[PDB]
Design a protein around this nucleic acid. Structure first.
Ligand SMILES: [K+]
Ligand SMILES: [K+]
Ligand SMILES: [K+]
Ligand SMILES: [K+]
Ligand SMILES: [K+]
Ligand SMILES: [Mg+2]
Ligand SMILES: [Mg+2]
Ligand SMILES: [Mg+2]
Ligand SMILES: [Mg+2]
Ligand code: NA
Ligand code: NA
Ligand code: NA
Ligand code: NA
Ligand code: NA
Lengths: 53, 133, 183, 70, 4, 142, 149, 70, 100
RNA sequence: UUUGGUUGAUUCCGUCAACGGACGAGAUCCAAGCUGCCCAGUAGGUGCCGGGAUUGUCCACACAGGACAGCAUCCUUCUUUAGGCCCCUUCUCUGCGGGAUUCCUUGCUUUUCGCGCAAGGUGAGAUUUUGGGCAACAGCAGGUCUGUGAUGCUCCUCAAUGUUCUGGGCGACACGCGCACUACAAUGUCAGUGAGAACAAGAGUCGACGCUCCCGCUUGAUCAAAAGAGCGGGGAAACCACGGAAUCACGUAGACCCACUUGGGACCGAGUAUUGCAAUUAUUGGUCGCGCAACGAGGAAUGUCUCGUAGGCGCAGCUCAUCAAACUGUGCCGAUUACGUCCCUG
């Protein structure tokens, strides 16, 4: 009843989480990625993103 | 290209406000507090006055016709949304306030908020900004 | 058939000459229809001297933060200037513009080297001439009823006559007089 | 600047008396010779061209240049 | 906010 | 009974103008539907008009010109049109006519302006991070 | 003689004549006839909320409807969403960067209603409006009228 | 500047040494030959290599060269 | 437009290999084949600050990812078309068969 | 691994108690500008055959109305969101390729030579072709324990520095400093008419039998904006989309005329609709008032920049339930000056 309440609503910044590390700060939402920027740079090669220019 | 009629007058007195003899009629009525542009255009249209007359020949009947239009704007099919005080939190009436009556209502609002002791009232009393800034 | 181009379809480039033999090679008089060219005139060191003279006057007009890049407006302002010049002088407008550029720049300058007098090259003479005309007209028409197309015509005409009542000529004398006493 | 706003007799006659002799005619210039508004000057010049006392040289939305008819 |  | 037709193109910045030149009972030039001599900017009318005025109207006697322009603003479209027109007559004269007649108009074209037959290769420069444009940098404070 | 015709080239079409002159003539024809109905909303409203002041031309409604006829003539099957795009401007927002705003789609609905009442325009099924045979005839007859003039 | 580096220069000498015949003063013919007997990845290097080879041949037609050693 | 086969992947070489040998599988039956069509190539871009802590000069990092798409039209009976399309598929390449 | 010339270059030539080698520079990689094959029912065109509209012996020519094409030729032009067929691949789409090499002349170049420079020519392009990306060896007690189920020592650990809920704050103003946005008007402000860009984006992998995301057409409308509602489309080269952006243009016979004024929009009053479980300390958008708030071009000092650049003008993405004066990209108009030197700072 009162244990979660606000979290059970599921709205706003505090309801997203990072897919890899569960953090809620600086998430990438483009193309429905939901990976934080720090973790994206480490895994970008495996995702299929390469730096050409 | 009409010649000056020698009855051309400066500071035309209207609604207790001196209105310049020059300037077009819509932009001369703008100097009466509460009227403003986009309302002087409607005032001239509903009073049957050309907007290219430049206050040079504003006969007393035309001034009286103008003054009665602004006195009761709703009588001339002015919409209610086109008005100063739409619902008057105190009286509960729709009206347009002009010519040194808007300031009186302004000080009435400030004291009304002070007696309420609302946040907007106390910020007005101290001289601070009442919006989010 | 083909006929010689005429500027704005009213003015002819034929029978044009430069009385100053020094600037003859740096003032272009090739016939054109309009002062719009859109060519790469800054690729090489001396290639900017081949722009037609009327175009160079057009380029200098659009200067301040407002007006940066309004070439079409500048052409319209230049176009209306020519008939005012033609009415005032009763002579080919392009001829008057050619004369004014010839006599509108100081031929001797002083530079910090204590300052010592030096000479001025032909290219700098043409560039500084047009620059001072536009600058003089632009500051005359600010906060004034005179408007720019008929502010620029009077100063160009005054410069051509050599009268001291012009921004270009008045500044040219002051620079030359200082350079003399500064040597 | 005390430019007049409505045409008055002394300026009214001066419009057909002295202006048509001028070599170059422009609303900016005319507003200076006769102390009238620039808007008033443009109307008066259009009045003269319709009469036929002056000729329009260059025409545009913002700028107009007139000269004497002959 | 206020700056002055 | 017989059809004479050529197709050329020209580009200024990103505008592409496609011009079709064919034999017709009377000469006509239409740009994006609206005919020439009705284009509102008189300056841009002169720039397009100069494609025929340099060589003369006698060579455009019974030719119909149809031009379509797409992209890149207003002035850049006028310049692409005049290039597609100039290349059109040269291409049309290349066939249906002797070789001496051609290269007698080319020299007149290339004397007046190189861009009347050669495209300008200039394009916008990409923006880089840390800069407000291609070149200008962020302000320094100290 | 600027009205002398060149060899061939008989008649004229709307796409040929100068655009502003055709609109001015068409607006006068609507005014001089008098069958077009002007709503009582045509004295208070602005063209769009991006504008700042009401129109200064007394015949602005007649001018606008003529222009709407021209746009539908050029592009059949256009709707209120398209016509708002054609009439746009930049809005002054104070100490903020300017932004572009579209014309109010309420007024364009009224303009299309007046033309439809004047049997000059009909709506394609499942799409916008196109111009009828009478509407095409009206536009071209005026265009030839200007050329002869 | 348009200086040719050591990689370009050394390969050019090797090509002239092994294939002095079939070579002439024409760049375009030489470029086709170089493309035949080279396996370099870059096209830019092969253009420069053929350019320096033609320059060597022109000098050879006038006098001996220290590094050529035919 | 009887049969539409669309292929897309992340490797241009693999995409070209599948199309070329799909054509020979088609060329061994005498189907009516409309030539391969190269749809526009799409690139997905993501820009991100390099630093993990917001310090120093603001240096960025632009990543990209390219997708190639090809289209082939076949006009043949269904039980036949399945035989052509029964070929082995290179890893990383997806194939969609649709009928309109 | 120095000195002499040369180069952006420890790039080359020559000389040499050094000879042979490795990195970095160059090359490679991406994107532009010119072209070859392959391509089409998601890109585009060319003939005809239907259907629809206007059409002149002269004459007339805007209220004041002007300057600029077509006329020895076989026959006047536009549209088809009433459309049938025939021919095609210049324009678009792109996976591999060609194309530039100081190539060719002239003149300079350590006494010659050598390495090379400058002007011109060929050319789509003429000097790292133009922009990027990558970038050695040594370091700094530079930043991050506020990214992680990265982590050592050390603190709190059940009436907690763990975890969750309710309400506040992070935004408070006498002030000072950095960076932006808007202006100080006529090369202008306001109101109309015209032609016109690219980069892009869009819905389930938990909840209502259907949906959630992005849009089009009507209606609302016998009367504002802002919106409720019907009807549909799109998994995105098929929908939005002939992508009607803003600077811009207009012989618009438009309004204003040098003034803190129709310049500028700060501050404040009243009515409404939407997002959200919740809008007061105004979320936001729209309407009418307030404009008697400074501000008339800015002292000392000081920042960025060399060709589709500077400056000006907008658009998309991102953050995002609702908010962009920010950043990341994109196109549109489009210049002045220099082609130098070591005076200042390095
Ligand atoms: K900064
Ligand atoms: K070091
Ligand atoms: K903060
Ligand atoms: K930020
Ligand atoms: K130094
Ligand atoms: Mg050592
Ligand atoms: Mg430290
Ligand atoms: Mg204002
Ligand atoms: Mg004011
Ligand atoms: Na002025
Ligand atoms: Na503004
Ligand atoms: Na702005
Ligand atoms: Na050097
Ligand atoms: Na720790």
């Amino acid at each position: 009843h009162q244990w979660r309440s606000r979290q059970k609503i599921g709205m706003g910044k505090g309801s997203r989480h990072c897919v890899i590390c569960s953090n809620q700060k600086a998430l990438i939402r483009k193309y429905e990625l939901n990976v934080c920027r720090q973790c994206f740079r480490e895994n970008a090669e495996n995702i299929g993103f390469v730096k050409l220019r | 290209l009409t010649l000056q009629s020698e009855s051309f007058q400066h500071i035309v007195r209207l609604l207790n406000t001196n209105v310049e003899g020059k300037r077009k009629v819509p932009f001369a009525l703008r100097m009466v507090k509460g009227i403003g542009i986009r309302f002087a255009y409607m005032v001239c249209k509903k009073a049957g006055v050309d907007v290219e007359r430049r206050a040079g020949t504003l006969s007393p009947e035309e001034l009286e016709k103008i003054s009665e239009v602004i006195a009761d704007p709703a009588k001339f099919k002015i919409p209610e949304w086109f008005l100063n005080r739409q619902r008057d939190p105190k009286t509960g009436k729709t009206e347009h306030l002009t010519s040194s009556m808007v300031d009186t209502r302004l000080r009435e609002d400030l004291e009304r908020l002070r007696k309420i002791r609302a946040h907007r009232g106390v910020r007005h009393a101290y001289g601070l900004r009442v919006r989010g800034q | 058939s083909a006929k010689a181009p005429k500027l704005f379809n009213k003015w002819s480039y034929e029978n044009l000459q430069t009385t100053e033999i020094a600037l003859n090679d740096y003032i272009t008089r090739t016939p054109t229809y309009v002062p719009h060219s859109a060519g790469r005139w800054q690729k090489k060191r001396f290639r900017k001297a081949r722009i037609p003279i009327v175009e160079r006057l057009t380029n200098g007009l659009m200067f301040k933060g407002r007006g940066n890049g309004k070439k079409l407006q500048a052409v319209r302002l230049v176009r209306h200037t020519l008939e005012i010049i033609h009415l005032l002088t009763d002579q080919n407008p392009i001829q008057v513009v050619i004369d004014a550029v010839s006599k509108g720049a100081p031929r001797e300058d002083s530079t910090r080297v204590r300052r010592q007098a030096v000479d001025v090259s032909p290219m700098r003479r043409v560039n500084e001439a047009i620059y001072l005309m536009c600058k003089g007209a632009r500051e005359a028409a600010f906060r004034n009823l005179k408007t720019l197309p008929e502010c620029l015509a009077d100063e160009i005409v005054n410069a051509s006559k050599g009268s001291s009542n012009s921004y270009a000529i008045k500044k040219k004398d002051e620079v030359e007089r200082v350079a003399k006493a500064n040597r | 600047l005390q430019n007049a706003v409505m045409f008055d007799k002394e300026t009214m006659d001066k419009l057909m008396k002295e202006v048509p002799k001028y070599k170059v005619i422009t609303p900016s210039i005319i507003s200076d010779r006769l102390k009238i508004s620039v808007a008033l000057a443009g109307k008066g010049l259009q009045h003269l061209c319709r009469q036929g006392l002056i000729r329009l040289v260059s025409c545009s939305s913002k700028f107009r240049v007139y000269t004497r008819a002959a | 906010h206020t700056c002055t | 009974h017989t059809l004479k037709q050529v197709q050329t193109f020209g580009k200024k910045k990103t505008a592409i103008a496609v011009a079709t030149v064919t034999k017709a009972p009377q000469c006509n030039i239409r740009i994006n539907g609206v005919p020439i001599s009705q284009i509102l900017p008189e300056t841009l009318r002169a720039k397009i008009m100069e494609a025929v005025k340099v060589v003369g109207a006698r060579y455009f006697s019974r030719l119909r010109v149809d031009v379509r322009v797409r992209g890149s603003g207003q002035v850049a479209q006028a310049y692409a049109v005049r290039q597609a027109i100039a290349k059109g007559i040269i291409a049309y004269y290349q066939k249906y006519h002797n070789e001496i007649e051609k290269a007698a108009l080319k020299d007149k074209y290339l004397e007046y302006d190189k861009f009347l037959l050669i495209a300008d290769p200039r394009r916008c420069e990409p923006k880089k991070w840390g800069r407000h444009s291609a070149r200008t940098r962020f302000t320094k404070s100290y | 003689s600027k009205i002398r015709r060149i060899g061939k080239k008989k008649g004229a079409t709307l796409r040929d004549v100068h655009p502003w002159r055709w609109v001015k003539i068409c607006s006068q024809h609507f005014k001089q006839e008098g069958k077009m109905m002007v709503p009582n909303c045509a004295e208070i409203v602005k063209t769009s909320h991006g504008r700042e002041r009401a129109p200064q031309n007394p015949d602005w409604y007649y001018i606008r409807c003529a222009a709407v006829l021209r746009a539908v003539y050029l592009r059949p099957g256009v709707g209120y969403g398209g016509l708002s795009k054609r009439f746009s401007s930049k809005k002054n927002r104070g100490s903020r960067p300017e932004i572009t705003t579209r014309a109010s789609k309420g007024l364009l609905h009224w303009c299309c209603k007046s033309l439809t009442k004047l049997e000059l325009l009909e709506k394609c099924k499942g799409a916008g409006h196109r111009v009828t045979k009478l509407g095409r005839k009206v536009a071209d007859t005026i265009a030839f009228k200007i050329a002869l003039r | 500047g348009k200086i040719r580096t050591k990689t370009v220069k050394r390969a050019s000498k090797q090509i002239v040494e092994k294939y002095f015949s079939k070579l002439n003063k024409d760049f375009y013919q030489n470029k086709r030959i170089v493309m035949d007997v080279t396996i370099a990845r870059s096209k830019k290097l092969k253009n420069k290599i053929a350019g320096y080879a033609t320059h060597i041949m022109k000098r050879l037609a006038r006098g001996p060269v220290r590094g050529i050693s035919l | 437009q009887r049969v539409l086969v669309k292929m897309t992947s992340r490797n241009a070489k693999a995409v070209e290999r599948v199309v070329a040998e799909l054509l020979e599988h088609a060329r061994t039956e005498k189907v009516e084949v409309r030539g391969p069509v190269r749809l526009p190539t799409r690139r997905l871009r993501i820009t991100t600050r390099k630093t993990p802590c917001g310090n120093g000069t603001n240096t960025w990092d632009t990543f990209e990812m390219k997708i190639y798409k090809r289209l082939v039209d076949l006009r043949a009976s269904t039980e036949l078309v399945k035989k052509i399309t029964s070929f082995q598929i290179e890893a990383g390449v997806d194939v969609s068969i649709t009928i309109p």
